[PDB]
Amino acid sequence: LKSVEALRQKGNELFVQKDYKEAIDAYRDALTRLDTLILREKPGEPEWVELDRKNIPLYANMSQCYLNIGDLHEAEETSSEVLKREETNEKALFRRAKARIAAWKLDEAEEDLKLLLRNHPAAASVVAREMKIVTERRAEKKADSRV
């Protein structure tokens, strides 16, 4: 349980040095231990939840690492894990949008940014900026097919 905190902390160290591959392997290992600790608890009970909340920082940190590296599927997947637990999480929605956008999943990047803006009104300008990328990318893709 403090073996996991330690590895979170190690991942966080690697992250701030732009050494993202290893950040992931550290976070992925914190995830593995934390799982074994969850499998022991009675499922769904309050003790389960509080052990399970600890996944959130780990998947959040990791999704950015994945983003930072070009792993769009995983970036999206790990961000989705935050979103499973915190539906309107600002950072998770943003990151998933960024993943989706880069992935050409444009309807869906738009859903996220709308949801972002709906729950986080001060995300305005950041949302404006990415909706701009979406909305023109939809112009490229759909003049690329009327060629």
Short mmCIF file of N, CA, C and O in Angstrom, two decimals:
data_model
loop_
_atom_site.label_atom_id
_atom_site.label_comp_id
_atom_site.label_asym_id
_atom_site.label_seq_id
_atom_site.Cartn_x
_atom_site.Cartn_y
_atom_site.Cartn_z
N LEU A 1 0.83 -1.26 0.00
CA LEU A 1 0.00 0.00 0.00
C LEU A 1 0.85 1.29 0.00
O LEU A 1 0.44 2.31 -0.55
N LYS A 2 2.02 1.24 0.64
CA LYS A 2 3.05 2.29 0.52
C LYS A 2 4.13 1.86 -0.50
O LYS A 2 4.98 2.66 -0.88
N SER A 3 4.11 0.60 -0.91
CA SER A 3 4.85 0.16 -2.08
C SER A 3 4.28 0.81 -3.33
O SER A 3 4.99 1.00 -4.32
N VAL A 4 2.99 1.11 -3.30
CA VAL A 4 2.29 1.67 -4.45
C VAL A 4 2.47 3.18 -4.49
O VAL A 4 2.68 3.76 -5.54
N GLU A 5 2.33 3.81 -3.34
CA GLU A 5 2.59 5.21 -3.28
C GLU A 5 4.02 5.44 -3.82
O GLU A 5 4.24 6.31 -4.63
N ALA A 6 4.96 4.61 -3.42
CA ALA A 6 6.36 4.82 -3.79
C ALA A 6 6.53 4.78 -5.29
O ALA A 6 7.27 5.59 -5.88
N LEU A 7 5.87 3.84 -5.93
CA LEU A 7 6.00 3.73 -7.37
C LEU A 7 5.24 4.85 -8.10
O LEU A 7 5.67 5.29 -9.17
N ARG A 8 4.13 5.31 -7.53
CA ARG A 8 3.46 6.48 -8.08
C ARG A 8 4.47 7.62 -8.12
O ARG A 8 4.69 8.27 -9.14
N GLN A 9 5.09 7.82 -6.98
CA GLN A 9 6.11 8.83 -6.83
C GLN A 9 7.29 8.70 -7.77
O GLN A 9 7.79 9.72 -8.24
N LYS A 10 7.71 7.46 -8.04
CA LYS A 10 8.77 7.22 -9.00
C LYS A 10 8.28 7.59 -10.41
O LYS A 10 8.91 8.38 -11.10
N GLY A 11 7.16 7.05 -10.84
CA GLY A 11 6.52 7.52 -12.10
C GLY A 11 6.46 9.05 -12.25
O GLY A 11 6.81 9.60 -13.29
N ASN A 12 6.06 9.72 -11.17
CA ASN A 12 5.98 11.17 -11.17
C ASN A 12 7.31 11.80 -11.33
O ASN A 12 7.41 12.84 -11.94
N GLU A 13 8.34 11.18 -10.77
CA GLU A 13 9.72 11.68 -10.99
C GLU A 13 10.14 11.56 -12.44
O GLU A 13 10.81 12.46 -12.99
N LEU A 14 9.79 10.44 -13.07
CA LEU A 14 10.21 10.18 -14.45
C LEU A 14 9.47 11.14 -15.36
O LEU A 14 10.03 11.68 -16.32
N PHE A 15 8.21 11.39 -15.03
CA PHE A 15 7.42 12.29 -15.82
C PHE A 15 8.00 13.71 -15.94
O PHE A 15 8.10 14.27 -17.01
N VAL A 16 8.31 14.32 -14.83
CA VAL A 16 8.89 15.65 -14.83
C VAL A 16 10.26 15.71 -15.54
O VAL A 16 10.71 16.80 -15.93
N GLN A 17 10.90 14.57 -15.78
CA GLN A 17 12.11 14.58 -16.60
C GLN A 17 11.89 14.18 -18.04
O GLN A 17 12.86 13.80 -18.71
N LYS A 18 10.65 14.28 -18.51
CA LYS A 18 10.29 13.87 -19.89
C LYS A 18 10.70 12.43 -20.27
O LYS A 18 10.82 12.13 -21.46
N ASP A 19 10.89 11.56 -19.28
CA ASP A 19 11.26 10.18 -19.54
C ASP A 19 10.05 9.28 -19.38
O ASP A 19 9.94 8.51 -18.43
N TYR A 20 9.16 9.36 -20.38
CA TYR A 20 7.75 8.94 -20.27
C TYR A 20 7.53 7.43 -20.35
O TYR A 20 6.59 6.93 -19.71
N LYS A 21 8.36 6.72 -21.13
CA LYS A 21 8.27 5.25 -21.26
C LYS A 21 8.30 4.58 -19.88
O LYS A 21 7.44 3.77 -19.52
N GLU A 22 9.31 4.95 -19.11
CA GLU A 22 9.57 4.40 -17.79
C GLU A 22 8.56 4.91 -16.79
O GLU A 22 8.25 4.19 -15.85
N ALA A 23 8.06 6.13 -16.97
CA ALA A 23 6.99 6.63 -16.11
C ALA A 23 5.85 5.65 -16.16
O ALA A 23 5.31 5.28 -15.11
N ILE A 24 5.49 5.24 -17.38
CA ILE A 24 4.42 4.28 -17.62
C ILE A 24 4.68 2.95 -16.96
O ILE A 24 3.81 2.43 -16.28
N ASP A 25 5.86 2.39 -17.19
CA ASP A 25 6.19 1.12 -16.55
C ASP A 25 6.16 1.22 -15.02
O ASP A 25 5.76 0.28 -14.36
N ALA A 26 6.53 2.37 -14.45
CA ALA A 26 6.38 2.58 -13.01
C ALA A 26 4.91 2.67 -12.63
O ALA A 26 4.48 2.09 -11.62
N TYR A 27 4.12 3.40 -13.42
CA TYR A 27 2.72 3.56 -13.06
C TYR A 27 2.00 2.25 -13.27
O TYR A 27 1.10 1.93 -12.51
N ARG A 28 2.40 1.51 -14.30
CA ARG A 28 1.76 0.25 -14.70
C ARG A 28 2.00 -0.83 -13.64
O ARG A 28 1.20 -1.76 -13.46
N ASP A 29 3.12 -0.69 -12.96
CA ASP A 29 3.50 -1.54 -11.86
C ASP A 29 2.79 -1.15 -10.56
O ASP A 29 2.35 -2.01 -9.84
N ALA A 30 2.62 0.14 -10.29
CA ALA A 30 1.76 0.57 -9.17
C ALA A 30 0.32 0.04 -9.30
O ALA A 30 -0.29 -0.46 -8.34
N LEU A 31 -0.20 0.15 -10.52
CA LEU A 31 -1.48 -0.45 -10.95
C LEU A 31 -1.60 -1.96 -10.64
O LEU A 31 -2.63 -2.43 -10.13
N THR A 32 -0.54 -2.71 -10.96
CA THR A 32 -0.53 -4.15 -10.77
C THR A 32 -0.64 -4.50 -9.27
O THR A 32 -1.48 -5.31 -8.88
N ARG A 33 0.18 -3.88 -8.44
CA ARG A 33 0.13 -4.12 -7.00
C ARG A 33 -1.19 -3.71 -6.41
O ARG A 33 -1.74 -4.40 -5.59
N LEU A 34 -1.66 -2.56 -6.82
CA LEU A 34 -2.88 -1.99 -6.27
C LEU A 34 -4.08 -2.89 -6.59
O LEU A 34 -5.04 -2.94 -5.83
N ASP A 35 -3.99 -3.60 -7.71
CA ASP A 35 -5.00 -4.57 -8.12
C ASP A 35 -5.10 -5.72 -7.13
O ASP A 35 -6.17 -6.01 -6.59
N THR A 36 -3.96 -6.38 -6.89
CA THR A 36 -3.89 -7.48 -5.96
C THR A 36 -4.51 -7.04 -4.64
O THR A 36 -5.19 -7.84 -4.02
N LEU A 37 -4.28 -5.80 -4.22
CA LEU A 37 -4.87 -5.34 -2.96
C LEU A 37 -6.39 -5.19 -3.04
O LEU A 37 -7.08 -5.36 -2.02
N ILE A 38 -6.90 -4.86 -4.23
CA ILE A 38 -8.34 -4.71 -4.48
C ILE A 38 -9.02 -6.11 -4.53
O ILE A 38 -10.08 -6.32 -3.92
N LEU A 39 -8.39 -7.06 -5.22
CA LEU A 39 -8.91 -8.44 -5.32
C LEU A 39 -9.18 -9.11 -3.97
O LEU A 39 -10.05 -9.98 -3.87
N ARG A 40 -8.44 -8.70 -2.95
CA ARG A 40 -8.63 -9.18 -1.56
C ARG A 40 -9.90 -8.62 -0.85
O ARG A 40 -10.47 -9.29 0.03
N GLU A 41 -10.32 -7.41 -1.21
CA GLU A 41 -11.45 -6.76 -0.53
C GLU A 41 -12.78 -7.29 -1.03
O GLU A 41 -12.84 -7.81 -2.16
N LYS A 42 -13.82 -7.20 -0.21
CA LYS A 42 -15.15 -7.59 -0.66
C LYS A 42 -15.61 -6.56 -1.70
O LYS A 42 -15.49 -5.36 -1.47
N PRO A 43 -16.10 -7.03 -2.86
CA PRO A 43 -16.28 -6.16 -3.99
C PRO A 43 -17.41 -5.15 -3.84
O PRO A 43 -18.51 -5.49 -3.48
N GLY A 44 -17.11 -3.88 -4.09
CA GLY A 44 -18.10 -2.83 -3.99
C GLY A 44 -18.24 -2.21 -2.63
O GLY A 44 -18.77 -1.12 -2.52
N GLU A 45 -17.76 -2.87 -1.57
CA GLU A 45 -17.91 -2.36 -0.19
C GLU A 45 -17.12 -1.04 -0.09
O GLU A 45 -16.34 -0.71 -0.98
N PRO A 46 -17.36 -0.24 0.97
CA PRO A 46 -16.68 1.07 1.02
C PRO A 46 -15.16 0.95 0.96
O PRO A 46 -14.52 1.76 0.28
N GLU A 47 -14.62 -0.09 1.58
CA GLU A 47 -13.17 -0.35 1.54
C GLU A 47 -12.67 -0.63 0.10
O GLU A 47 -11.52 -0.35 -0.25
N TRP A 48 -13.55 -1.18 -0.74
CA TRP A 48 -13.21 -1.45 -2.12
C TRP A 48 -13.04 -0.14 -2.86
O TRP A 48 -12.04 0.10 -3.54
N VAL A 49 -14.02 0.73 -2.70
CA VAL A 49 -14.08 2.02 -3.42
C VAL A 49 -12.84 2.85 -3.15
O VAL A 49 -12.24 3.45 -4.05
N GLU A 50 -12.45 2.90 -1.88
CA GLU A 50 -11.38 3.80 -1.50
C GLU A 50 -10.06 3.25 -2.00
O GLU A 50 -9.21 4.03 -2.41
N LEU A 51 -9.88 1.94 -2.01
CA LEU A 51 -8.71 1.36 -2.68
C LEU A 51 -8.77 1.63 -4.19
O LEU A 51 -7.73 1.89 -4.82
N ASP A 52 -9.97 1.58 -4.78
CA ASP A 52 -10.13 1.73 -6.23
C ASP A 52 -9.93 3.17 -6.71
O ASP A 52 -9.42 3.38 -7.81
N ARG A 53 -10.30 4.15 -5.88
CA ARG A 53 -10.06 5.57 -6.21
C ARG A 53 -8.60 5.84 -6.48
O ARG A 53 -8.27 6.79 -7.20
N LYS A 54 -7.73 5.03 -5.92
CA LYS A 54 -6.31 5.21 -6.11
C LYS A 54 -5.85 4.91 -7.52
O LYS A 54 -4.71 5.22 -7.89
N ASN A 55 -6.71 4.29 -8.32
CA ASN A 55 -6.34 4.06 -9.70
C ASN A 55 -6.33 5.35 -10.47
O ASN A 55 -5.66 5.43 -11.49
N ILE A 56 -7.12 6.33 -10.03
CA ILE A 56 -7.42 7.53 -10.84
C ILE A 56 -6.20 8.36 -11.13
O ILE A 56 -5.95 8.74 -12.28
N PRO A 57 -5.42 8.67 -10.10
CA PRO A 57 -4.20 9.42 -10.41
C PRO A 57 -3.28 8.62 -11.30
O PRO A 57 -2.56 9.19 -12.08
N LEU A 58 -3.29 7.31 -11.16
CA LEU A 58 -2.38 6.47 -11.92
C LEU A 58 -2.77 6.39 -13.39
O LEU A 58 -1.96 6.55 -14.30
N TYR A 59 -4.03 6.17 -13.65
CA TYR A 59 -4.43 6.19 -15.07
C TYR A 59 -4.35 7.64 -15.68
O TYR A 59 -4.04 7.81 -16.89
N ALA A 60 -4.58 8.66 -14.86
CA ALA A 60 -4.55 10.04 -15.36
C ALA A 60 -3.11 10.34 -15.85
O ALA A 60 -2.88 10.66 -17.02
N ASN A 61 -2.14 10.13 -14.96
CA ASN A 61 -0.72 10.39 -15.24
C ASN A 61 -0.23 9.65 -16.47
O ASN A 61 0.43 10.19 -17.33
N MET A 62 -0.60 8.40 -16.52
CA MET A 62 -0.25 7.49 -17.59
C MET A 62 -0.86 7.88 -18.94
O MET A 62 -0.28 7.61 -19.99
N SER A 63 -2.09 8.40 -18.92
CA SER A 63 -2.73 8.74 -20.19
C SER A 63 -1.96 9.86 -20.82
O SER A 63 -1.79 9.88 -21.99
N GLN A 64 -1.50 10.79 -20.03
CA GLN A 64 -0.69 11.86 -20.60
C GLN A 64 0.62 11.35 -21.20
O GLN A 64 1.09 11.92 -22.21
N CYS A 65 1.23 10.36 -20.53
CA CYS A 65 2.48 9.75 -20.96
C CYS A 65 2.20 9.16 -22.31
O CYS A 65 2.94 9.36 -23.26
N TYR A 66 1.10 8.43 -22.40
CA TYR A 66 0.74 7.81 -23.68
C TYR A 66 0.53 8.85 -24.76
O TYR A 66 1.06 8.74 -25.85
N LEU A 67 -0.20 9.89 -24.42
CA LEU A 67 -0.39 11.02 -25.32
C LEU A 67 0.98 11.47 -25.79
O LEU A 67 1.25 11.43 -26.99
N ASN A 68 1.86 11.77 -24.83
CA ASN A 68 3.18 12.34 -25.10
C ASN A 68 4.07 11.56 -26.06
O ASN A 68 4.99 12.11 -26.63
N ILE A 69 3.73 10.30 -26.27
CA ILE A 69 4.52 9.29 -26.99
C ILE A 69 3.93 8.88 -28.36
O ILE A 69 4.63 8.31 -29.21
N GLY A 70 2.62 9.07 -28.50
CA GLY A 70 1.93 8.73 -29.74
C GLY A 70 1.01 7.54 -29.60
O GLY A 70 0.55 6.99 -30.62
N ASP A 71 0.74 7.12 -28.36
CA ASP A 71 -0.16 5.98 -28.17
C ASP A 71 -1.57 6.47 -27.82
O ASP A 71 -1.93 6.67 -26.64
N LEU A 72 -2.34 6.61 -28.89
CA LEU A 72 -3.59 7.33 -28.88
C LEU A 72 -4.62 6.42 -28.32
O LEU A 72 -5.49 6.85 -27.56
N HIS A 73 -4.52 5.16 -28.68
CA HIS A 73 -5.48 4.20 -28.22
C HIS A 73 -5.36 4.15 -26.71
O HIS A 73 -6.34 4.37 -25.99
N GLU A 74 -4.15 3.95 -26.21
CA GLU A 74 -3.99 3.83 -24.75
C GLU A 74 -4.25 5.14 -23.99
O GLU A 74 -4.83 5.14 -22.92
N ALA A 75 -3.80 6.25 -24.55
CA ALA A 75 -4.08 7.52 -23.98
C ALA A 75 -5.59 7.61 -23.78
O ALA A 75 -6.03 7.79 -22.65
N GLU A 76 -6.38 7.37 -24.83
CA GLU A 76 -7.82 7.36 -24.73
C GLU A 76 -8.35 6.35 -23.73
O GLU A 76 -9.27 6.65 -22.96
N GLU A 77 -7.79 5.16 -23.76
CA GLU A 77 -8.28 4.09 -22.88
C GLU A 77 -8.08 4.40 -21.40
O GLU A 77 -8.98 4.18 -20.59
N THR A 78 -6.89 4.89 -21.06
CA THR A 78 -6.58 5.22 -19.67
C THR A 78 -7.36 6.45 -19.23
O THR A 78 -7.93 6.46 -18.14
N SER A 79 -7.44 7.47 -20.06
CA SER A 79 -8.39 8.54 -19.80
C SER A 79 -9.79 8.02 -19.64
O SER A 79 -10.50 8.41 -18.76
N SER A 80 -10.22 7.08 -20.44
CA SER A 80 -11.57 6.57 -20.17
C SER A 80 -11.78 5.94 -18.79
O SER A 80 -12.90 5.94 -18.26
N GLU A 81 -10.72 5.40 -18.22
CA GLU A 81 -10.77 4.81 -16.89
C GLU A 81 -10.99 5.87 -15.82
O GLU A 81 -11.74 5.64 -14.89
N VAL A 82 -10.39 7.04 -15.97
CA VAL A 82 -10.71 8.12 -15.05
C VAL A 82 -12.20 8.41 -15.17
O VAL A 82 -12.94 8.58 -14.16
N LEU A 83 -12.64 8.46 -16.43
CA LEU A 83 -13.98 8.97 -16.72
C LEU A 83 -15.03 7.98 -16.21
O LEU A 83 -16.18 8.37 -15.86
N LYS A 84 -14.64 6.70 -16.13
CA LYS A 84 -15.50 5.66 -15.52
C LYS A 84 -15.82 6.06 -14.10
O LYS A 84 -16.94 5.93 -13.66
N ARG A 85 -14.85 6.65 -13.42
CA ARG A 85 -14.97 6.95 -11.99
C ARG A 85 -15.37 8.39 -11.67
O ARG A 85 -16.03 8.61 -10.64
N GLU A 86 -14.89 9.34 -12.50
CA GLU A 86 -15.22 10.78 -12.37
C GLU A 86 -15.68 11.30 -13.75
O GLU A 86 -14.89 11.72 -14.54
N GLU A 87 -16.99 11.25 -14.00
CA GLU A 87 -17.57 11.44 -15.35
C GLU A 87 -17.28 12.78 -16.04
O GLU A 87 -17.26 12.86 -17.27
N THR A 88 -17.18 13.82 -15.23
CA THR A 88 -16.88 15.15 -15.72
C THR A 88 -15.49 15.61 -15.32
O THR A 88 -15.27 16.81 -15.23
N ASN A 89 -14.56 14.69 -15.08
CA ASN A 89 -13.15 15.09 -14.79
C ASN A 89 -12.51 15.96 -15.90
O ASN A 89 -12.33 15.56 -17.03
N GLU A 90 -12.16 17.17 -15.54
CA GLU A 90 -11.72 18.19 -16.50
C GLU A 90 -10.55 17.69 -17.32
O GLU A 90 -10.58 17.74 -18.55
N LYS A 91 -9.54 17.16 -16.63
CA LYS A 91 -8.29 16.86 -17.28
C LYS A 91 -8.41 15.63 -18.13
O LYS A 91 -7.84 15.57 -19.20
N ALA A 92 -9.22 14.69 -17.69
CA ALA A 92 -9.43 13.44 -18.37
C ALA A 92 -10.21 13.70 -19.65
O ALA A 92 -9.86 13.20 -20.71
N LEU A 93 -11.25 14.52 -19.56
CA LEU A 93 -12.00 14.88 -20.75
C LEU A 93 -11.09 15.59 -21.75
O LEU A 93 -11.19 15.41 -22.95
N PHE A 94 -10.26 16.49 -21.27
CA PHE A 94 -9.44 17.23 -22.20
C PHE A 94 -8.54 16.29 -22.90
O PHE A 94 -8.42 16.31 -24.13
N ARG A 95 -7.89 15.44 -22.12
CA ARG A 95 -6.85 14.57 -22.69
C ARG A 95 -7.44 13.62 -23.64
O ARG A 95 -6.89 13.41 -24.68
N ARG A 96 -8.58 13.03 -23.31
CA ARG A 96 -9.30 12.15 -24.23
C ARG A 96 -9.72 12.85 -25.52
O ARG A 96 -9.67 12.25 -26.60
N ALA A 97 -10.20 14.07 -25.39
CA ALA A 97 -10.42 14.84 -26.58
C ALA A 97 -9.11 14.89 -27.42
O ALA A 97 -9.13 14.77 -28.64
N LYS A 98 -7.97 15.08 -26.79
CA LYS A 98 -6.80 15.40 -27.58
C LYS A 98 -6.41 14.16 -28.30
O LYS A 98 -5.89 14.22 -29.43
N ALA A 99 -6.63 13.03 -27.62
CA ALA A 99 -6.31 11.72 -28.18
C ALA A 99 -7.17 11.49 -29.41
O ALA A 99 -6.65 11.15 -30.47
N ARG A 100 -8.47 11.67 -29.22
CA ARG A 100 -9.47 11.39 -30.23
C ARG A 100 -9.22 12.21 -31.48
O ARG A 100 -9.30 11.69 -32.61
N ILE A 101 -8.92 13.49 -31.25
CA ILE A 101 -8.66 14.44 -32.32
C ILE A 101 -7.52 13.93 -33.16
O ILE A 101 -7.62 13.87 -34.37
N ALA A 102 -6.42 13.57 -32.50
CA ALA A 102 -5.24 13.12 -33.17
C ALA A 102 -5.54 11.80 -33.89
O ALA A 102 -4.88 11.43 -34.91
N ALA A 103 -6.57 11.11 -33.39
CA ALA A 103 -6.95 9.80 -33.91
C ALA A 103 -7.97 9.91 -35.07
O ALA A 103 -8.35 8.90 -35.65
N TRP A 104 -8.40 11.13 -35.39
CA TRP A 104 -9.50 11.40 -36.33
C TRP A 104 -10.88 10.89 -35.85
O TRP A 104 -11.76 10.60 -36.67
N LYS A 105 -11.08 10.84 -34.54
CA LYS A 105 -12.37 10.45 -33.99
C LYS A 105 -13.12 11.69 -33.61
O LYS A 105 -13.21 12.04 -32.42
N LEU A 106 -13.66 12.37 -34.61
CA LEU A 106 -13.96 13.79 -34.51
C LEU A 106 -15.33 14.06 -33.92
O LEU A 106 -15.50 14.91 -33.06
N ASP A 107 -16.32 13.30 -34.33
CA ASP A 107 -17.58 13.36 -33.60
C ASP A 107 -17.34 13.24 -32.10
O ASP A 107 -17.95 13.94 -31.30
N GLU A 108 -16.43 12.36 -31.72
CA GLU A 108 -16.27 11.98 -30.32
C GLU A 108 -15.39 12.89 -29.55
O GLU A 108 -15.61 13.09 -28.36
N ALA A 109 -14.38 13.44 -30.22
CA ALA A 109 -13.60 14.50 -29.63
C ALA A 109 -14.52 15.69 -29.34
O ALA A 109 -14.38 16.33 -28.32
N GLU A 110 -15.50 15.96 -30.22
CA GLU A 110 -16.46 17.03 -30.02
C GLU A 110 -17.38 16.80 -28.80
O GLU A 110 -17.59 17.73 -28.00
N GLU A 111 -17.93 15.59 -28.65
CA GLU A 111 -18.69 15.21 -27.44
C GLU A 111 -17.96 15.59 -26.14
O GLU A 111 -18.48 16.32 -25.28
N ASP A 112 -16.73 15.11 -26.02
CA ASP A 112 -15.84 15.41 -24.87
C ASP A 112 -15.66 16.87 -24.62
O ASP A 112 -15.98 17.30 -23.57
N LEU A 113 -15.22 17.64 -25.62
CA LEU A 113 -15.09 19.10 -25.48
C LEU A 113 -16.38 19.81 -25.13
O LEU A 113 -16.36 20.76 -24.41
N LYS A 114 -17.50 19.34 -25.64
CA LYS A 114 -18.81 19.91 -25.24
C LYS A 114 -19.08 19.60 -23.75
O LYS A 114 -19.55 20.43 -22.99
N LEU A 115 -18.79 18.36 -23.37
CA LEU A 115 -19.01 17.94 -22.01
C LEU A 115 -18.05 18.70 -21.09
O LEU A 115 -18.46 19.15 -20.03
N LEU A 116 -16.81 18.87 -21.53
CA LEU A 116 -15.84 19.66 -20.81
C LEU A 116 -16.42 21.03 -20.50
O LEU A 116 -16.58 21.42 -19.32
N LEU A 117 -16.85 21.70 -21.56
CA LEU A 117 -17.26 23.10 -21.47
C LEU A 117 -18.51 23.23 -20.59
O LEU A 117 -18.58 24.10 -19.76
N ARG A 118 -19.46 22.32 -20.76
CA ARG A 118 -20.69 22.25 -19.98
C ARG A 118 -20.44 22.22 -18.46
O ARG A 118 -21.19 22.78 -17.66
N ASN A 119 -19.38 21.53 -18.05
CA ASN A 119 -19.11 21.33 -16.61
C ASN A 119 -17.97 22.19 -16.11
O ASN A 119 -17.81 22.35 -14.94
N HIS A 120 -17.18 22.73 -17.03
CA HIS A 120 -16.05 23.55 -16.68
C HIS A 120 -16.01 24.81 -17.57
O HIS A 120 -15.19 24.94 -18.46
N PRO A 121 -16.88 25.77 -17.26
CA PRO A 121 -17.01 26.99 -18.06
C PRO A 121 -15.70 27.78 -18.29
O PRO A 121 -15.65 28.55 -19.22
N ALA A 122 -14.66 27.58 -17.48
CA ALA A 122 -13.40 28.33 -17.61
C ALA A 122 -12.41 27.64 -18.53
O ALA A 122 -11.37 28.18 -18.83
N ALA A 123 -12.71 26.40 -18.91
CA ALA A 123 -12.06 25.78 -20.04
C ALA A 123 -12.39 26.48 -21.39
O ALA A 123 -11.93 26.02 -22.42
N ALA A 124 -13.20 27.53 -21.39
CA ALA A 124 -13.66 28.17 -22.66
C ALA A 124 -12.59 28.27 -23.76
O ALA A 124 -12.78 27.72 -24.84
N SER A 125 -11.49 28.93 -23.50
CA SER A 125 -10.59 29.28 -24.59
C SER A 125 -9.82 28.05 -25.07
O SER A 125 -9.61 27.87 -26.25
N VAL A 126 -9.42 27.21 -24.15
CA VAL A 126 -8.86 25.93 -24.51
C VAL A 126 -9.85 25.12 -25.36
O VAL A 126 -9.47 24.49 -26.35
N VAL A 127 -11.12 25.16 -25.01
CA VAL A 127 -12.10 24.44 -25.83
C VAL A 127 -12.26 25.07 -27.22
O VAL A 127 -12.30 24.37 -28.22
N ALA A 128 -12.35 26.39 -27.28
CA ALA A 128 -12.42 27.11 -28.54
C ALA A 128 -11.29 26.70 -29.49
O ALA A 128 -11.49 26.49 -30.69
N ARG A 129 -10.10 26.61 -28.93
CA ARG A 129 -8.91 26.30 -29.69
C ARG A 129 -8.95 24.89 -30.30
O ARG A 129 -8.53 24.69 -31.43
N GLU A 130 -9.42 23.90 -29.55
CA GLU A 130 -9.46 22.54 -30.08
C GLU A 130 -10.68 22.31 -30.97
O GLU A 130 -10.60 21.60 -31.99
N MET A 131 -11.81 22.89 -30.64
CA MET A 131 -12.93 22.83 -31.56
C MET A 131 -12.55 23.43 -32.91
O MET A 131 -13.14 23.10 -33.93
N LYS A 132 -11.59 24.35 -32.90
CA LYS A 132 -11.15 24.95 -34.13
C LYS A 132 -10.42 23.90 -34.98
O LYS A 132 -10.53 23.89 -36.21
N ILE A 133 -9.65 23.06 -34.31
CA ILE A 133 -8.84 22.07 -34.98
C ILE A 133 -9.80 21.02 -35.54
O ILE A 133 -9.72 20.63 -36.71
N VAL A 134 -10.75 20.62 -34.72
CA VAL A 134 -11.76 19.66 -35.15
C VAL A 134 -12.46 20.15 -36.39
O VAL A 134 -12.49 19.49 -37.43
N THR A 135 -13.02 21.35 -36.27
CA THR A 135 -13.98 21.88 -37.22
C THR A 135 -13.32 22.10 -38.58
O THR A 135 -14.00 22.05 -39.60
N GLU A 136 -12.00 22.32 -38.62
CA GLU A 136 -11.33 22.50 -39.89
C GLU A 136 -10.86 21.17 -40.41
O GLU A 136 -11.01 20.88 -41.59
N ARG A 137 -10.33 20.33 -39.54
CA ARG A 137 -10.06 18.95 -39.91
C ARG A 137 -11.25 18.23 -40.57
O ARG A 137 -11.06 17.47 -41.54
N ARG A 138 -12.47 18.46 -40.09
CA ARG A 138 -13.68 17.99 -40.82
C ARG A 138 -13.87 18.58 -42.22
O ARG A 138 -14.60 18.01 -43.02
N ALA A 139 -13.28 19.75 -42.46
CA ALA A 139 -13.28 20.39 -43.77
C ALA A 139 -12.27 19.70 -44.72
O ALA A 139 -12.59 19.47 -45.90
N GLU A 140 -11.08 19.39 -44.19
CA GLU A 140 -10.04 18.68 -44.95
C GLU A 140 -10.55 17.32 -45.35
O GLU A 140 -10.61 17.01 -46.53
N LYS A 141 -10.93 16.51 -44.36
CA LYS A 141 -11.38 15.13 -44.61
C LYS A 141 -12.53 15.10 -45.61
O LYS A 141 -12.55 14.24 -46.49
N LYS A 142 -13.47 16.05 -45.50
CA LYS A 142 -14.65 16.07 -46.39
C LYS A 142 -14.64 17.11 -47.52
O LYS A 142 -15.69 17.52 -48.00
N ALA A 143 -13.45 17.56 -47.90
CA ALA A 143 -13.18 18.02 -49.25
C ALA A 143 -12.17 17.04 -49.88
O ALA A 143 -12.04 16.99 -51.11
N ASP A 144 -11.48 16.26 -49.06
CA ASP A 144 -10.56 15.21 -49.54
C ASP A 144 -11.33 14.06 -50.19
O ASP A 144 -10.75 13.30 -50.98
N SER A 145 -12.62 13.92 -49.86
CA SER A 145 -13.47 12.84 -50.39
C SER A 145 -14.48 13.28 -51.47
O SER A 145 -15.12 12.43 -52.08
N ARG A 146 -14.64 14.58 -51.67
CA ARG A 146 -15.40 15.10 -52.82
C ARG A 146 -14.46 15.43 -53.97
O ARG A 146 -14.87 16.11 -54.91
N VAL A 147 -13.22 14.92 -53.93
CA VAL A 147 -12.17 15.31 -54.90
C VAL A 147 -12.55 15.01 -56.38
O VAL A 147 -11.96 14.16 -57.05
#
